[PDB]
Amino acid sequence: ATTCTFSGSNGASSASKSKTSCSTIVLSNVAVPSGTTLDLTKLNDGTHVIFSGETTFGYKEWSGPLISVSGSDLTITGASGHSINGDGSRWWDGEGGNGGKTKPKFFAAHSLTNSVISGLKIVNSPVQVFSVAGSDYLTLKDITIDNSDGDDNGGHNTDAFDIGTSTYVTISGATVYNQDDCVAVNSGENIYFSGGYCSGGHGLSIGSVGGRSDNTVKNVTFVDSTIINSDNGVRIKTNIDTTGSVSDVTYKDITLTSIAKYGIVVQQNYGDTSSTPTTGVPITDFVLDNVHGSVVSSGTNILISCGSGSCSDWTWTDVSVSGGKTSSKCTNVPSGASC
Ligand SMILES: *[C@@H]1O[C@H](CO)[C@@H](O[C@@H]2O[C@H](CO)[C@@H](O[C@H]3O[C@H](CO)[C@@H](O)[C@H](O)[C@@H]3O)[C@H](O)[C@H]2NC(C)=O)[C@H](O)[C@H]1NC(C)=O
Ligand SMILES: *[C@H]1O[C@H](CO)[C@@H](O)[C@H](O)[C@@H]1O
Ligand SMILES: *[C@H]1O[C@H](CO)[C@@H](O)[C@H](O)[C@@H]1O
Ligand SMILES: *[C@H]1O[C@H](CO)[C@@H](O)[C@H](O)[C@@H]1O
Ligand SMILES: *[C@H]1O[C@H](CO)[C@@H](O)[C@H](O)[C@@H]1O
Ligand SMILES: *[C@H]1O[C@H](CO)[C@@H](O)[C@H](O)[C@@H]1O
Ligand SMILES: *[C@H]1O[C@H](CO)[C@@H](O)[C@H](O)[C@@H]1O
Ligand SMILES: *[C@H]1O[C@H](CO)[C@@H](O)[C@H](O)[C@@H]1O
Ligand SMILES: *[C@H]1O[C@H](CO)[C@@H](O)[C@H](O)[C@@H]1O
Ligand SMILES: *[C@H]1O[C@H](CO)[C@@H](O)[C@H](O)[C@@H]1O
Ligand SMILES: *[C@H]1O[C@H](CO)[C@@H](O)[C@H](O)[C@@H]1O
Known part of the structure; x- marks a missing residue:
């Protein structure tokens, strides 16, 4: 030794x-x-x-x-x-x-x-902080x-955690003050994020998914976390004209405070929001459970831009996002959800 x-x-x-x-x-x-x-x-x-x-x-x-x-x-x-x-x-x-x-x-x-x-x-990163790739059974805990x-x-x-081609990664007790995604899962399976505090960035994001050989996201959980003074709260982004899948994604016991643009945003036309959403990256078995918070008056509560048929099997339990505009541009919203 x-x-x-x-x-x-x-x-x-x-x-x-x-x-x-x-x-x-x-x-x-x-x-x-x-x-x-x-x-x-x-x-x-x-x-x-x-x-x-x-x-x-x-x-x-x-x-x-x-x-x-x-x-x-x-x-x-x-x-x-x-x-x-x-x-x-x-x-x-x-x-x-x-x-x-x-x-x-x-x-x-x-x-x-x-x-x-x-x-x-970690203090004052130039650009993205953690790039997680090709990793298995990784715990990141109490990271500031x-x-x-x-x-x-x-x-x-200045993304805090960018994850790709990884499985069984656990993130707990993260404290993040930044200017981009607090978490971005680009691909990966069995991802767990808990006890996190995300301030100033662009939310807790799935995506962007598609356009790489790694285009599957499965079984990710965000729980007991706060997103404050951020552009977005809950976010799923899949790239237009690409294929992949997003399934068994859960956000649970989440507090959203002073969100600036979108409390909840799901976009299947990411990359080109002037075009209609495409259907190659199905988002299924998406659960929100006890997700609450406030959007500033100039933001939008919920935006769902789904492709025809490419969003299904959502369960939204005890969800309440208020303070902002109700959108009239939501498309192909599944049965359990609403803008
Ligand atoms: C969906 O992802 C979940 C989060 O990764 C996952 O739960 C995790 O399951 C693993 C088993 O593969 C557990 O991990 C192991 O390590 C602990 C101690 O280190 C052992 O006691 C376990 O026996 C096991 O070897 C994780 O503890 C567990 N994480 C949590 C937060 O629940 C699920 O299994 C995934 N669900 C599906 C259906 O695949
Ligand atoms: C390197 O030097 C430090 C002394 O600061 C020790 O902590 C360690 O055991 C190693 O010898
Ligand atoms: C190197 O040294 C540190 C302190 O002795 C240990 O924590 C470690 O397991 C390894 O032996
Ligand atoms: C700890 O690890 C070092 C090298 O990894 C060894 O040289 C040492 O004997 C102990 O196994
Ligand atoms: C790396 O560190 C070891 C231990 O101090 C040296 O012996 C070696 O030459 C290199 O500098
Ligand atoms: C960096 O510096 C160390 C010690 O001077 C060298 O061992 C190494 O090869 C490199 O030049
Ligand atoms: C880095 O540290 C090693 C071991 O202390 C030295 O041998 C080397 O010259 C450099 O200063
Ligand atoms: C940092 O500390 C090492 C010894 O731990 C020195 O070799 C180095 O010059 C610097 O003071
Ligand atoms: C790195 O540079 C410092 C600062 O001048 C030296 O003291 C050290 O030994 C190494 O060359
Ligand atoms: C690191 O970068 C600085 C700035 O280009 C150089 O001065 C240095 O020699 C090293 O390449
Ligand atoms: C780190 O630096 C040492 C020498 O500085 C290399 O041997 C090693 O491959 C790595 O570049």
């Missing part, structure tokens, strides 16, 4: 070259050089990684990731008082991932099996993401 401590301005290099001799790696006030990844890929099974002090990154216009981890039976945690500081205002230019500077993604959680990431505190400075400083596309 070995414990390895890496720190300072050359910590990232040493960690990379010695990671496989370390049972435990502690990362203390590591300053990652510009244009380079903190490469924690391919750790030995059972390795424990502890973030300590303040982790920082040199400035460069590149696409990331800033941190990358992969392997099995890993524990990665944060020590008391630590933070991982992206100092994103260096890149923030109002354009996020769409244009302006090239901005690096923060945390590649790829090819993780049976691992836990707990207690990390504070991009609140981005609200008035050009923060854009």
Whole structure:
């Protein structure tokens, strides 16, 4: 059993070259050089990684990731008082991932099996924070993401959790202040989100689904969570002219507070809302249970833009969204639901 401590301005290099001799790696006030990844890929099974002090990154216009981890039976945690500081205002230019500077993604959680990431505190990511991909039985718990400075400083596309090609991922106790989706499930199965607080972004989203070889979303649950001061609350987006499926999606015991645009929005014409919704990505067995909240007077309570026949078997129990306009543009609403 070995414990390895890496720190300072050359910590990232040493960690990379010695990671496989370390049972435990502690990362203390590591300053990652510009244009380079903190490469924690391919750790030995059972390795424990502890973030300590303040982790920082040199400035460069590149696409990331800033941190990358992969392997099995890993524990990665944060020590008391630590933070991982992206100092994103260096890149923030109002354009996020769409244009302006090239901005690096923060945390590649790829090819993780049976691992836990707990207690990390991330501050001011340049753009998206967690990219979860190709991972199985991953728990992300008590993660704090504070991009609140981005609200008035050009923060854009600062998604907290982007999930794809993953199964059995559990997210609990997340606290997010950001400017895009709190969660986006692009594809994946058996996803559980609970005890979350999402402020400032675009809601808890399924989507966008379709147009990739990975286009199935199944068995996802959002429960006991608050979405506040966000553009949308509950959201399902499927890409127009694409095929896939979304099934067994549940939102339960959700509080929506001061939603700006849409309390609940389901769009089967995502990508081109001037066109009629298409029917290639059926949304079935969608359940809302005890979902309550308020939309500002200028927003819309509920928008359902379904394709003909491509939305069915919805159950909406104890749902109440008020404060906003009732939409008159809803299409092909299933029997259990309403705008
Ligand atoms: C729909 O997704 C649900 C959430 O992933 C899933 O429930 C989860 O089921 C797994 C079993 O595959 C449970 O996990 C395992 O780990 C615990 C301890 O780590 C063991 O005690 C279990 O025996 C098992 O090995 C999860 O605990 C459970 N998660 C929760 C929050 O319920 C459902 O199984 C999925 N439903 C369908 C029909 O597939
Ligand atoms: C690296 O150095 C630190 C001292 O801060 C220890 O915590 C650890 O055991 C390792 O030797
Ligand atoms: C961080 O800490 C290590 C020892 O833990 C030093 O080797 C390094 O120079 C920096 O002070
Ligand atoms: C990284 O750069 C620092 C800061 O100058 C050094 O002290 C360290 O040993 C490494 O070269
Ligand atoms: C980063 O720096 C460490 C220590 O200087 C080297 O071992 C590594 O190969 C890379 O140059
Ligand atoms: C990173 O840390 C290792 C082990 O402390 C050093 O050997 C290397 O020079 C770099 O500073
Ligand atoms: C991290 O850095 C070390 C040397 O700096 C490499 O050996 C490793 O492949 C990774 O690039
Ligand atoms: C990685 O870290 C180990 C442990 O300090 C060194 O022995 C190795 O040379 C590399 O710097
Ligand atoms: C913990 O892990 C390291 C390498 O992963 C071993 O060298 C050590 O003996 C213990 O198994
Ligand atoms: C490395 O060291 C830490 C503290 O000793 C452990 O938590 C871990 O299991 C591994 O042995
Ligand atoms: C990281 O990026 C900065 C800015 O381009 C360079 O100065 C540095 O040498 C490294 O490539």
